[PDB]
Every structure is written in structure tokens, then in C-alpha cells.
Amino acid sequence: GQMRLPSADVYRFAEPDSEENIIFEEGIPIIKAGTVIKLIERLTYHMYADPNFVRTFLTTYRSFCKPQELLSLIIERFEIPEPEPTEADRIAIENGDQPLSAELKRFRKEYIQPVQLRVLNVCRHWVEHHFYDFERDAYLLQRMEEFIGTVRGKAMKKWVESITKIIQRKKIANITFQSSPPTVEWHISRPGHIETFDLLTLHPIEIARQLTLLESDLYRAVQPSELVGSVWTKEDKEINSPNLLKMIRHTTNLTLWFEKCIVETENLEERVAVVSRIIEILQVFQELNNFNGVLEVVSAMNSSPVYRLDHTFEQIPSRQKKILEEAHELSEDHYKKYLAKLRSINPPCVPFFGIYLTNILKTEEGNPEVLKRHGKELINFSKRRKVAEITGEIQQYQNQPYCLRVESDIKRFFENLNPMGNSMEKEFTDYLFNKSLEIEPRNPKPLPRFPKKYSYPLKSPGVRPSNPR
Amino acid sequence: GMTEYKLVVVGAGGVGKSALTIQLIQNHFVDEYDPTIEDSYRKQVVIDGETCLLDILDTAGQEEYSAMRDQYMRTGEGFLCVFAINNTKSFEDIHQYREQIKRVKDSDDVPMVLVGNKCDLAARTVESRQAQDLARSYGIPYIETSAKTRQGVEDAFYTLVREIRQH
Amino acid sequence: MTEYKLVVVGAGGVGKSALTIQLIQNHFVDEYDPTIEDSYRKQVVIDGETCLLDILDTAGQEEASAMRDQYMRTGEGFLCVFAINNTKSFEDIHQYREQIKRVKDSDDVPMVLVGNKCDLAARTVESRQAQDLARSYGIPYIETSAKTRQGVEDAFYTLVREIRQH
Numbered sequence A: 001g002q003m004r005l006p007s008a009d010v011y012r013f014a015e016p017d018s019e020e021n022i023i024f025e026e027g028i029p030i031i032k033a034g035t036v037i038k039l040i041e042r043l044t045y046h047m048y049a050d051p052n053f054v055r056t057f058l059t060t061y062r063s064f065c066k067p068q069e070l071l072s073l074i075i076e077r078f079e080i081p082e083p084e085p086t087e088a089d090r091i092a093i094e095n096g097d098q099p100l101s102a103e104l105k106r107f108r109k110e111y112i113q114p115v116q117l118r119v120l121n122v123c124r125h126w127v128e129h130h131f132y133d134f135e136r137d138a139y140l141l142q143r144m145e146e147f148i149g150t151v152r153g154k155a156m157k158k159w160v161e162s163i164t165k166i167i168q169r170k171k172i173a174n175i176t177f178q179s180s181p182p183t184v185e186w187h188i189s190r191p192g193h194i195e196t197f198d199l200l201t202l203h204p205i206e207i208a209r210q211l212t213l214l215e216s217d218l219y220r221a222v223q224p225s226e227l228v229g230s231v232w233t234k235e236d237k238e239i240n241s242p243n244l245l246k247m248i249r250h251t252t253n254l255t256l257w258f259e260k261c262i263v264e265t266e267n268l269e270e271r272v273a274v275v276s277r278i279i280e281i282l283q284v285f286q287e288l289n290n291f292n293g294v295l296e297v298v299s300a301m302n303s304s305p306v307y308r309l310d311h312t313f314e315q316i317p318s319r320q321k322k323i324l325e326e327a328h329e330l331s332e333d334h335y336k337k338y339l340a341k342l343r344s345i346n347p348p349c350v351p352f353f354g355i356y357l358t359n360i361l362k363t364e365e366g367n368p369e370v371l372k373r374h375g376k377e378l379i380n381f382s383k384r385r386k387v388a389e390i391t392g393e394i395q396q397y398q399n400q401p402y403c404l405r406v407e408s409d410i411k412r413f414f415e416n417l418n419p420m421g422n423s424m425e426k427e428f429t430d431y432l433f434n435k436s437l438e439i440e441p442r443n444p445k446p447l448p449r450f451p452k453k454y455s456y457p458l459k460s461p462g463v464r465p466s467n468p469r
Numbered sequence B: 001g002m003t004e005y006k007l008v009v010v011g012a013g014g015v016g017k018s019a020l021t022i023q024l025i026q027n028h029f030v031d032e033y034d035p036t037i038e039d040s041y042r043k044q045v046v047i048d049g050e051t052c053l054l055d056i057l058d059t060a061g062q063e064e065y066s067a068m069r070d071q072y073m074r075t076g077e078g079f080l081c082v083f084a085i086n087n088t089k090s091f092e093d094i095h096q097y098r099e100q101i102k103r104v105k106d107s108d109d110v111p112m113v114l115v116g117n118k119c120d121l122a123a124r125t126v127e128s129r130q131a132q133d134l135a136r137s138y139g140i141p142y143i144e145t146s147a148k149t150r151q152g153v154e155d156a157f158y159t160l161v162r163e164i165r166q167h
Numbered sequence C: 001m002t003e004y005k006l007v008v009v010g011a012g013g014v015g016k017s018a019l020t021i022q023l024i025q026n027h028f029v030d031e032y033d034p035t036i037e038d039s040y041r042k043q044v045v046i047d048g049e050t051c052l053l054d055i056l057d058t059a060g061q062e063e064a065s066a067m068r069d070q071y072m073r074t075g076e077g078f079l080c081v082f083a084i085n086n087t088k089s090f091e092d093i094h095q096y097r098e099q100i101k102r103v104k105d106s107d108d109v110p111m112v113l114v115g116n117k118c119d120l121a122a123r124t125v126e127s128r129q130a131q132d133l134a135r136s137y138g139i140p141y142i143e144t145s146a147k148t149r150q151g152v153e154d155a156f157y158t159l160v161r162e163i164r165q166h
């Protein structure tokens, strides 16, 4: 038969499952809703491990339980009472013999040790992957150190000593490939001559590579703490979502730089060379699976200042028109083709983050925090699972590094790009649109001619890589 | 077959804008939502006896991607310009959203509606008369909606479709 | 995208976690932090087909030895890892093989035998002895180094191919 459990009066996690405290979805069960006590019981269940549940819970629990209260509850979970001797044990002891303690030994082996180990696994995952709770609350960290540091008994000893060391390392806190990265490519600008760096003087292959390294690093830096609770949309967004906002602001700045390069090139022939070069950069972004970069270019080409430049579009070579149109089609029909392409490529890649943000926000806004059942309020855990499915997808694409060499000067050039200067957004985007009207006036105004502005050759070196010995 | 209307929701972030489309598209009577499922933003409706399909673009959460606004807006035939009735800044933003729509669509007469959204019980700071006056100065309808009771939600979208039909 | 459930098993300290983290992050973990249970996901194209690997990294320490049935039920294929400088870990392989067969009630479970730490000169398990064992199981034998990446993709992606053909 099943093991007997402690009395629910001395140990709260032995209360029987009922529809008043846990609801399952329709081969381990999937929880739709439950009390916090039942969620923690299943987080640390004696019959099975649920590593996905541990990640989901630790990512999302702050919407229904404070960090200090979570720690209290898992310590309470850990402290399991042992059963009293059975009748057979009593009779053995009364005869001066050693009891078999069969039921006690089974309860230790099949209930206490698995539950206690799974509590420690929650602690380990909490410290390793969600350490911000402890960075923001020093007293929470003291309580965790004290709890782990006072666990006795040899069954847990290896993990207790390990978790103690992991905590200490996290308080004071390398990539291998088998292939070499390709050689850095140079065009008109030569190494070390940062003062000449520009859209047409750097090699378009190397522009796309260095922007991909930059955008990959920005993508990889975003933690779930910047996302759960929709905090990047709220008044404290600069405090709670700084890496996300840095990533978005880079994307916005690059798009505006592309627009500025285009509309400040008043000579039509030169402006065609500028647009063609940006489409070549887009082609390398596609080859690198840098979808953020792809959409940075597409957004610039569909901006109001650029979209209306019919005379420029007419002279773009047909093969480059097709590259741009295929990239644009990724976003059509609510990103249908983008989503399919992301799920088909071989990483590394740089996803477009905006879709994730909209889906997290709408999941949080469109589902209730609690479900009311039999007069009780149960935590709606299905809602939290949906959010954690999105953060898990984000994290899956954060693992794979690009096998590309950093060029520190080109990296710095793009880090310091500031197309808006000191201007405010409206002032700057009105400036870009007025430049568009200047260089290609609205019909029936005649098309003017403008002098050339570039003194170096406009011919592209192309986007096929070279390989000397 | 039936006409499809491509509608675009625009407005300040962080003040409950997404509740408008969620409440429309939702199973009205089950408070639940999965935005990831294909066609969680398409709804067949009957407006003035004529069946049509609404395709709604709501990029709520992407407000910081400001250089993508033009591309998103150009997909639309009609626009809901949404502010929160307890956030004066979101109301003051409306003028620039409307100007941007007109530029993107290259038209001085783009179908649009002004929507004042009640997203919580915090004190209202934009009175309905202020919003009615702004809407009249633009020549567009004004609809107020609740983010919690679904009041006004159908009216906002149906009024916009009527603006498209009567353009 | 087909999903594949891989499970990495073997004695404590043989490098199950280091192998998994090398595959997932291209990073070699120098620390020896004993695992309780960890899970990872990886999208990867194998033989032209995109799939999603769910990788369960399990506990090798003997104190966790009563908690294995639950993860063996869910796994579709198993990497059976020993370290080529630890004879005891090689002798432990047959216990994992027999438990997997019992739990899944099957003589035909996708598996790969992995001899890890092949960057180390001081080998105590000869390749021939491991290869003989693998042949008796009907499975391939792949020597790996989580430190250098030698053999790491080969081991995991060979297991995927065996699940695919199962």
C-alpha cells in the first residue's frame, strides 16, 4: 500500500488533494491552479522530479508569493517528521531486540529523502538562475545561507556543501569552438583608421558581422526578471528592465542611422548606392540568422522618409529588390513567416524581441491572477506556465554563441552611433521627412539634381567572403 | 467573399491599452487568453447586418521600438487611437499619433476613432468633455471603454468599421 | 520540429553536466557541483531536419540512486557516460543499462555508450573493453571530452538518430 504520511496538523503538506486546493489540466500531471501550499508540494513532490516546473515556478512566483515567504515555505517543506515505531517494532524492542523499522526506513527512502533533495534542488536553482532575489534583499540571502549551512545528516551532505560554495561564488561574481572564426574583412577604411569608418567605407560583410555580435550580446543579456510582471512597460522600467531597454534602443538607433544615411545622400546615384549597400548588409544578416538586424533594415526601408523614395527604388537592382521583399514578407500576417523561419534555422541566431514582449504582456493582461473555486481563491498557475513558456523560448536562443571575431574599433563605432544627436525624437524624425521631401519632392514638383558628397568609390565589394591563405 | 478590415491599435504603453483587443477577441464570457495561437487577433462579426472579418494589429509592449511604428501603421485601413483616462500624458500623445498616421498613410482623412480607456480605479484625470472636444476638432468619433467590464469595446471597433465603410 | 527527450546518466563525477553544458553553451565547467536534476533545451538541425532536444541531466551520486525510475520513464534515449580514467564508473554502466531496460520494459531502448575525459592521458579503461561492451548492447561507443569538445556533438546527435529510427 501507499506510505502513510505525517498528520496534516503537524505537517501542512500532507493535506489530501481536493478541488478546493488543486486543479489539474486535462505522464506527470499538469497543474492548472492551486493554493501556494499545494504548488510547493508539487514543486518538491516525492514521486517525480519536474525540472520544467521548477524553472516555471522560480521564474514567475513573485506574482503570488514574496521571496521571504517562499523561503519560509520551503524550509517548512524540508522539516518532515519521522513516523513512530510500528507494533512490530515495539514488540521487538520489548524483547531487547533491534527493530526492523521497515516502515520508517521506507518513509525515509521514498518520502523524506526525495522531498528534501528536491527542496535543495529548488534552492540550488534559485541561487544559480534567479540570484537577483538575493542581490536585492541581503536578509533573504542570510536566511538562505543559514538554512543550507545548518542542514545535518549525511544523505544531503554532498549537496549542502556544494550549495554553500555556489552561494559564496555567486556573491563575488569562456567559449570554445572547434572551428576558427572567419578572417575580418576590410574595404576602404583600413584597420586602426576609425576616423574614416562609415556605412560605405567599412566592408558590408564586416558591418553585418560586428552588428550581429553586438546585437547577440544585447539579446543574451536580457534576464526574465526584466520581463515578468510586464515591468518594462511600467513607471520603473529603467530600473527593472535596463538590458532590455538597451537592446531596444540599439535597434532603434541603427534603424534611424540607416534612414539618416539614405535621406542625407541627396544625389540620386549616390543614394541608390547607399540603399543597395544596406540591402547587402541585410543579406548577410539573413545568412547569420540575425533577425533583429533583418528587421532593423526592413523598418528603415518602410519608414515614412524612405518608403516614398520611388525614384531611388526604381534604380535598385532586381536581385536586391527581391532580397528586400523576401525580408519584408517575414513580418507580414503577424510575422507568420518569421515565426516559421526562426523555428527552422540552425542557431546561433538573434531573435526579434518585440513579439515576445507583446505575447508576455497580453498573456499577463488577458488571464486572471486567481481562479475562484468552491469559495476558495486558487493561484492561476496555467497563466504563469504560459509566461514561462515564452521566457524559456527566449532563454533557449540565448545559449548559442556566434563564431565571429570581434573587431574592437568597429564595435566601438557602432556602440557610439548617435544619429539623433542632441535632438528630440519628433524634431529628428520631422527632419528626416523634410529631407525626404527635399531630395524627391511630391508630384507634380520636378525632381531636382544634387551634387555628389562621397569622394571615394561607390562600388560595393560584395558580400561573398574572401579567404587568403 | 466577406470583407476583411485591417485595424491598428495605437497609443501610449503601460496604461492598459491591450485590454481593448483582448476583451473584443476574447471568449467574451471566459476570462482567458493565449495570444500566441494563430488568429487570436481575427474575429468574424456582423456590423449593421453585414458580416465581415476584423484583423486587429495591437503591438502593445513594443512601444520602445519607435522606429517600427511607421511600418506597423502602414498595414492599417483604420486606427483606434487609445489613451487612458487617468493618464494625461497618454492623452497629450494623441495629437502626435494622429499626425504620424496621416503621414504614414499620406492622407489628411484616415478612418480613426479616439478611445478613452478606463484601466483601473485610479482617479480620472481626463474629463470626457476634454476628449469630446479633441475628437470634434479632428472630426472623429470618441468612445469610452472599460478595461474590466467590456463596456464600450464593441462600440469602439464597430464605430471604426463604420468610419471605414463611410469613407 | 520534432521534440526528442534525451537523458544523460552515469556515475557521479564522470562529466555528465560538463558534457551537457558544453553542448548547450560551448563552455567547459571546471567546478564539480553535484547535480540533483537539471534540464536544458536546444534547437538544432540534424541531418537537415530541425528538432528540439530536451536534455535531462541526472544525479550520479549514490545518495540519489532511489530516484531514477521517474526520469527513466520519460526519456526516449539515454547517454550512458563513464570516465575513461575511472574504472568503477565503467563497471557502473551495466547497472544503468539494466535499470533502464527494466523501467521501460524493453530490450530495444535508444542508447549511446560515452567514454568521457578523453583529453586526459592517464586512461584506465581501454577503448577495446568499452567497445566490446557497446557491441554486446547493440549500441555505438563514442569517446568525448567536455573540455575540448571532441566527440560531444557526435555523442548527442548519434543518440538523436537512434531515437529517430526507433
Ligand SMILES: Nc1nc2c(ncn2[C@@H]2O[C@H](COP(=O)(O)OP(=O)(O)NP(=O)(O)O)[C@@H](O)[C@H]2O)c(=O)[nH]1
Binding pocket: C010, C011, C012, C013, C014, C015, C016, C017, C018, C019, C029, C030, C031, C032, C033, C034, C035, C036, C058, C059, C060, C061, C116, C117, C118, C119, C120, C144, C145, C146, C147, C148
Ligand atoms: N579533463 C576533463 N575534466 C572533465 C571532463 N568532463 C568533466 N570534467 C571535470 O570533472 C568534474 C565533474 O564534472 P561534472 O560534469 O560535474 O560531472 P557529473 O557527472 O555531472 N557529476 P554528478 O553526477 O555529481 O552530477 C568537474 O571538475 C569537471 O570539470 C572532461 O571531458 N575532461
Ligand SMILES: Cc1nc([N+](=O)[O-])cn1Cc1ccc(F)cc1
Binding pocket: A275, A298, A301, A302, A306, A307, A308, A309, A310, A312, A313, A316, A324, A325, A328
Ligand atoms: C518599395 C518598397 N518595398 C519595400 N519592401 O520592404 O519590400 C520597401 N519599399 C520602400 C523603399 C525601399 C527602398 C527604397 F530605396 C525606396 C523605397
Ligand SMILES: [Mg+2]
Binding pocket: C016, C017, C018, C033, C034, C035, C057, C058, C059, C060
Ligand atoms: Mg552533474
Ligand code: NA
Binding pocket: B086, B087, B088, B089, B125
Ligand atoms: Na495623469
